[PDB]
C-alpha cells in the first residue's frame, strides 16, 4: 500500500487527504 497526500482544491479549500492505493 503506497499513500500519499491528496490536495484537493474545494470551495477553495484545500483539503489534503492521506489516501493508501
Same mark, same amino acid.
Do not use: Q
Given at each position: &500500500?503506497f *499513500?500519499? #497526500? $491528496? *490536495? $484537493?482544491? =474545494? #470551495? &477553495? +479549500? =484545500? +483539503?489534503?487527504? =492521506? =489516501? *493508501? #492505493?
Open positions: &500500500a *499513500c500519499w #497526500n $491528496v *490536495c $484537493v482544491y =474545494r #470551495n &477553495a +479549500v =484545500r +483539503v489534503c487527504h =492521506r =489516501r *493508501c #492505493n
